[PDB]
Design a protein around this ligand. Structure first.
Ligand SMILES: Nc1ncnc2c1ncn2[C@@H]1O[C@H](COP(=O)(O)OP(=O)(O)O)[C@@H](O)[C@H]1O
Lengths: 62, 62
């Protein structure tokens, strides 16, 4: 509750690049970044892909 | 093809999902456990039906 997320949001605002945050707390399966091999039914890409998709830019603030 | 039109009914099985939803429907369920169960069911759907983690998730949900 110190504003680090707010600090990052302000930095993104100042830098003219999109903002995005990721939660890596206690995570164990790298799949959330690596998604899955996309041949198994229901496979989804990693959160970075979603961040790029929504941010609509290749130079957002991650 | 006749079945595909109606025979399949275009309805997902969701046997475990529907069973648990109806099981908890009568109960006055808190919202925290409500969202926890929703997330657990989403994870169960994301996993396969022939893996140990699937059985562990099913046991925890039971
Ligand atoms: N120096 C500051 N000036 C103004 N607001 C601040 C400051 N530091 C923190 N905040 C407040 O903190 C909130 C966001 O905190 P957050 O980034 O969630 O903390 P943490 O990074 O510890 O989780 C914002 O709504 C912001 O108003």
């Amino acid at each position: 509750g110190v504003g680090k997320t707010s600090i990052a949001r302000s930095i993104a605002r100042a830098l003219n690049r999109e903002y995005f945050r990721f939660s890596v707390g206690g995570m164990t399966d790298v799949a959330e970044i690596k998604g899955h091999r996309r041949t198994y039914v229901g496979a989804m890409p990693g959160k970075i892909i979603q961040c790029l998709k929504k941010t609509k830019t290749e130079n957002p603030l991650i | 093809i006749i079945k595909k039109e109606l025979g399949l009914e275009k309805d997902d099985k969701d046997a475990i999902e529907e069973k648990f939803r109806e099981r908890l429907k009568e109960l006055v369920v808190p919202k925290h456990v409500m969202d926890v169960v929703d997330e657990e069911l989403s994870k169960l759907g994301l996993l396969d039906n022939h893996s140990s983690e699937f059985n562990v998730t099913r046991n925890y949900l039971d």
